[PDB]
Design a protein around this ligand. Structure first.
Ligand SMILES: COc1ccc2[nH]cc(CCN)c2c1
Ligand SMILES: [Ca+2]
Length: 223
């Protein structure tokens, strides 16, 4: 996250870190046994880390649970990033409490202008690299479809939205991939892609979760 603030330990209780020997992507806990992330995060041998703040120090509220199955969306296109969503099933159910909690799926899509919270352990610099060990947060609005398409001609599908600031300076960045965009207490987005981070006229692009609720619910019910 570039231009954000330190969230505070366990203030984003649905945020997860995906770990394959190191943090490599975020995700969101949507019930006691399932995590949603980006399809571009896919790999084998994922351990899901819940209740994290400092990802390099055991602070006492963590739960570490191996993934038993990953399901990339059937229409994910790695070249265009269309349908950039994946589900991960945990080998055992997480113990839910005030610091580890699921986030609700949306019943409707959020409109442009809605303020959302984006969070992650990604790079905090737009040039150069500095990775934080504690979770960073950013409040940002959903941008209109027309501004999003004007910023990324030819590249925005109906399964994507832009959020952030056309002036630059505040954005998600490398290592935030797969993490949550939460608006009005519902998961509306997944950190997906962008052109660099925090550049003028290049806001972050997010998977539009409301288009996937039926797929998520049917997949969870059968797996
Ligand atoms: C350094 O630029 C990158 C590189 C990879 C990335 N993945 C996801 C994002 C979010 C950008 N809003 C991103 C940014
Ligand atoms: Ca920790």
């Amino acid at each position: 996250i570039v231009g954000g603030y330190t969230c505070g330990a366990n203030t984003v209780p649905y945020q997860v870190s995906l770990n394959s020997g190191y943090h490599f992507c975020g995700g969101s806990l949507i019930n006691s046994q399932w995590v949603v992330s980006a399809a571009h995060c896919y790999k084998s041998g994922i351990q899901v880390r819940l209740g994290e703040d400092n990802i390099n120090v055991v602070e006492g509220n963590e739960q570490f649970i191996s993934a038993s199955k990953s399901i990339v969306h059937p229409s994910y296109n790695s070249n265009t990033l269309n349908n950039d969503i994946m589900l991960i099933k945990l080998k055992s159910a997480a113990s839910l409490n005030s610091r580890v909690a699921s986030i609700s799926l949306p019943t409707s899509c959020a409109s442009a202008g809605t303020q959302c919270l984006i969070s992650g352990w990604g790079n905090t610099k737009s040039s150069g690299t500095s990775y934080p060990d504690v979770l960073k947060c950013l409040k940002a609005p959903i941008l209109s479809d027309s501004s999003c398409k004007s910023a990324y001609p030819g590249q925005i599908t109906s399964n994507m939205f832009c959020a952030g600031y056309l002036e630059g300076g505040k954005d998600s960045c490398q290592g935030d991939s797969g993490g949550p965009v939460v608006c009005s207490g519902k998961l509306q987005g997944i950190v997906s892609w962008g052109s660099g981070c925090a550049q003028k006229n290049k806001p972050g692009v997010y998977t539009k979760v409301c288009n996937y609720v039926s797929w998520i619910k049917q997949t969870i019910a059968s797996n």
